[PDB]
Amino acid sequence: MTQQEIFDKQRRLQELSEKVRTCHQEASALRKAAQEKEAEMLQVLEDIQTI
Amino acid sequence: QQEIFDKQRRLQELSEKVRTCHQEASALRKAAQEKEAEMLQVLEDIQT
Amino acid sequence: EIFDKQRRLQELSEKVRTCHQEASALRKAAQEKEAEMLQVLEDIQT
Amino acid sequence: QEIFDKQRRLQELSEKVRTCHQEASALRKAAQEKEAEMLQVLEDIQTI
16 A cells, blocks of 8 residues: 555556557457458349349 | 249348348447447546 | 546446457357358359 | 350359458457457456
């Protein structure tokens, strides 16, 4: 229960918070890519139906 | 024969099912984007 | 202070997990449904 | 005699759907791994 421990704990939170943010960016990008790819696939299906 | 036409109808229903899956997945992705954005703000709020 | 923020993060973390588990199940089902649609799409052209 | 071109298009597009399925699946699988990775880090925050 001291400032040293407080400073350490805060230092770790910031490092882990950064990690979490990175993971958020990557995951979001992957999800969007999946979305667009699915849309593409459906569009190719519609193209098969067209001819 | 009739079965081949029936297979085409089944293919259509399958495609529609896939479309449904895609829409639901879209909803879940948007929800995930919203939910993660709020907690990421809490982490940025922990800073400071 | 920091402990309170940990509890708030814990609240939202369980929400993200639930949304994650829900999406994971749909991902498996989406792949299978597409595979069947493809399997049908392959058999129709003999 | 447009059937030869149409049949070639049907085959090619079918293959394209098959590849888009594989690519989508891998991207979805990659997304799940990242979410799992994110959650594991969030567990570390609970540990302080």
